[PDB]
Amino acid sequence: TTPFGKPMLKHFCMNPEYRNLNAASCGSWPKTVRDQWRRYLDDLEAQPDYFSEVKQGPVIQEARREVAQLLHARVSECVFISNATTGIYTVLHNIPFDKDDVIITFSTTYGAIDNAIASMAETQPFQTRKVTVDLPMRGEDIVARFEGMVAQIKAEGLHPRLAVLETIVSIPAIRMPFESLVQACQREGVLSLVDGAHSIGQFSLNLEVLQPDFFIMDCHKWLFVPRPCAALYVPERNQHYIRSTIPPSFGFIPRTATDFETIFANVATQDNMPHMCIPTALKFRREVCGGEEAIYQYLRVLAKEGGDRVAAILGTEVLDEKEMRDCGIATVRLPLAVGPAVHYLSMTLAETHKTWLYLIDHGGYIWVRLCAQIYLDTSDFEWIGNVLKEICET
Amino acid sequence: TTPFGKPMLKHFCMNPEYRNLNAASCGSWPKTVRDQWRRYLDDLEAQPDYFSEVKQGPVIQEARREVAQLLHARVSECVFISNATTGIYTVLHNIPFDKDDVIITFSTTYGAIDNAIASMAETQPFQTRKVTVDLPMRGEDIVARFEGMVAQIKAEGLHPRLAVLETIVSIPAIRMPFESLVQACQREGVLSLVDGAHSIGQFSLNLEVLQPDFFIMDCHKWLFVPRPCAALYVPERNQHYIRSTIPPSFGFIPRTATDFETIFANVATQDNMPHMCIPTALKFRREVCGGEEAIYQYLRVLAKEGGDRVAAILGTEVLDEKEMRDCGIATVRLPLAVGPAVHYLSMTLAETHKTWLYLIDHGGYIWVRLCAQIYLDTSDFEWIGNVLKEICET
Ligand SMILES: *Cc1c(COP(=O)(O)O)cnc(C)c1O
Numbered sequence A, B: 001t002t003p004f005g006k007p008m009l010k011h012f013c014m015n016p017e018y019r020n021l022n023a024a025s026c027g028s029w030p031k032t033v034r035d036q037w038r039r040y041l042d043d044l045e046a047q048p049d050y051f052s053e054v055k056q057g058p059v060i061q062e063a064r065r066e067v068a069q070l071l072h073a074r075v076s077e078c079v080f081i082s083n084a085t086t087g088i089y090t091v092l093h094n095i096p097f098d099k100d101d102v103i104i105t106f107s108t109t110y111g112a113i114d115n116a117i118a119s120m121a122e123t124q125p126f127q128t129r130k131v132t133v134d135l136p137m138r139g140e141d142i143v144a145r146f147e148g149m150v151a152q153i154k155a156e157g158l159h160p161r162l163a164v165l166e167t168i169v170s171i172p173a174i175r176m177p178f179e180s181l182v183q184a185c186q187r188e189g190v191l192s193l194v195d196g197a198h199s200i201g202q203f204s205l206n207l208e209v210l211q212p213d214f215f216i217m218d219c220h221k222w223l224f225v226p227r228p229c230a231a232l233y234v235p236e237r238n239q240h241y242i243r244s245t246i247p248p249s250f251g252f253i254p255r256t257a258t259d260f261e262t263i264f265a266n267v268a269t270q271d272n273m274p275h276m277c278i279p280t281a282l283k284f285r286r287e288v289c290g291g292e293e294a295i296y297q298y299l300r301v302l303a304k305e306g307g308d309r310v311a312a313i314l315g316t317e318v319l320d321e322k323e324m325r326d327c328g329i330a331t332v333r334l335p336l337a338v339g340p341a342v343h344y345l346s347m348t349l350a351e352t353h354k355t356w357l358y359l360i361d362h363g364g365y366i367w368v369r370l371c372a373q374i375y376l377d378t379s380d381f382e383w384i385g386n387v388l389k390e391i392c393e394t
């Protein structure tokens, strides 16, 4: 109905002087979602205990049905949680680990996941090993080293029990061969904890075929809902491990919904408004945007072309292999070689240029994460490209 | 400026056909707070990454300063968390427990706290003992049994390490001698974890004199902010135990703000809007309500008189001792002696009578929790009293 690009800007609530090239952080949602937000806000204030005990429940169950459909998985396998950190931690904490189990990570593993595991080892006797990924790589070369580390764990007598994978590495942001890595995890009896914080709403996902052991994802990062909003997927063959939420509450389980579902329903006080907006956003995505596939192909090609376009203006490169760019994200190199410098950038991109990006010192050179969105156009990449060029020269 | 009672209703956003006798669940906030809420909502949608990285920080720090002042404690000792369950669990999880440490609870301890502790014992070797409180009691008789249990723990050779107290027992809701119990905890070297979920905004609190080892409280339950909103107080002499949030994130600590503060700042994605409204509510409470003390005395006397008034209509009693009613809560007995019955009540109080209460089968007789608020009047207690009487007879 509406074309992609700046014609979409009329359906979003962003200042015309604002260009959200970092939409996958706070999120970004259309006007029709905010309107729904305020109306639930209105209801909550009018009759608090009626909104919460009668009307709230149904909407959440619909949102679960729509997330489950978008993922090709049973609504009974999908549960709402506050954010990706809580869901990955919920899984890591329920699994009993032995003195001889090993948890495998990658140097790409999100930093908060490493802090989870380090803390778990203070009072639990398991151990850990990190697969060295120095980006760029080939997808297979990451799978190979992962194979090598499992083989070597079985050779020392220990037991490779679980591995933390990711779909999109946070930053430097690219797409990991998680399809291949889940299959590698299946062959050798290793639990595949997929950190798919960037997944739903950015590209297609079939959990029926992927069959991960656990799948966690942030809806607010790409599904046009506000932060915080995340969901957890656990197949039936694994729902027996999950016996408590984090923090524990009334649905705990000592050693017609299922018990698994009740665990994630009888929880402490939270605001389920972000989830209650999920339906509206999907409606918008179906009707105004021409369906999910339309949005995915646009996001990948914009990031493809807009990414190559920024690197041209700067004379640098977009992170790749020698497809890790099958996604609406382009990480570009910058003509650089400390933190007070990076600060200037930020507020020049903020008060001076009105926009916010995330940088990283990889390969000794600072990088930039460019987030595509259906309301951005290759000029806004040309625009930032020229903006970057300026601050760099200074 | 405005008198208490139904003249306040014009400053709140409750349906005139709604009587919130359960304000301490979802919360209840004035018009001036909602207006502030929507304006932050507006800002977040206009310039997402500028609202979050530049403007958000300052407001939260002011809110901490105002909570810390309302509690008589250093702003550096007070930190924002999502809800009371997460904060109590954050404390319980950071403290290393030995095979010979014992955690003490009471049959009044909130149910989600017991689930926390039970789960902790599956992988940690400590042990636990429960002080039997059969309400009604005298405050001293609860302190006595608590003394008895510590004496008996030291006699068996174990070490009383920590005790979970509460200010307001959830339901049947009364005030516990937590001042006395904190002093009992100090004398015998026992850590006093105060679950003060009902505390701030309901009655006066001085942490400088009380000196609890940990203090957790729900602002949204009485401080005219929306759910979820809670704060955690840890004195300096104890901030060394707290090395991670739950779930852990980037501020973790392996074995000019303080490290403690950074722990509760560098956290996963959350909405700090409830906290960012704290200032406005306090402004409202100072100006429209004539200060904090005005609100506390009104809440206690309304619950005092309105509670006695409901019990009169019903011919029953208000839970007490033979002051546990020094609070804006009255629990009344009902002329009863199962769950499908209680269901009818709910929707008759809901669709039929438009209001929601929490019942409990204590002393074999169902009880009712009456929550006073500055916008309620003794007629609304007379009103519910007559409503209760009717459904009871049927
Ligand atoms: C954003 C992100 C997270 C954490 O998401 P929260 O909502 O902050 O818990 C974790 N891992 C990766 C790779 C991410 O991109």
Ligand SMILES: *Cc1c(COP(=O)(O)O)cnc(C)c1O
Residues within 6 Å of the ligand: A268, A269, B083, B084, B085, B086, B110, B166, B168, B169, B170, B195, B197, B198, B218, B228
């Ligand atoms: C309300 C309450 C809690 C839990 O508060 P949440 O915000 O749901 O974590 C715990 N204990 C008591 C006594 C309460 O009244």
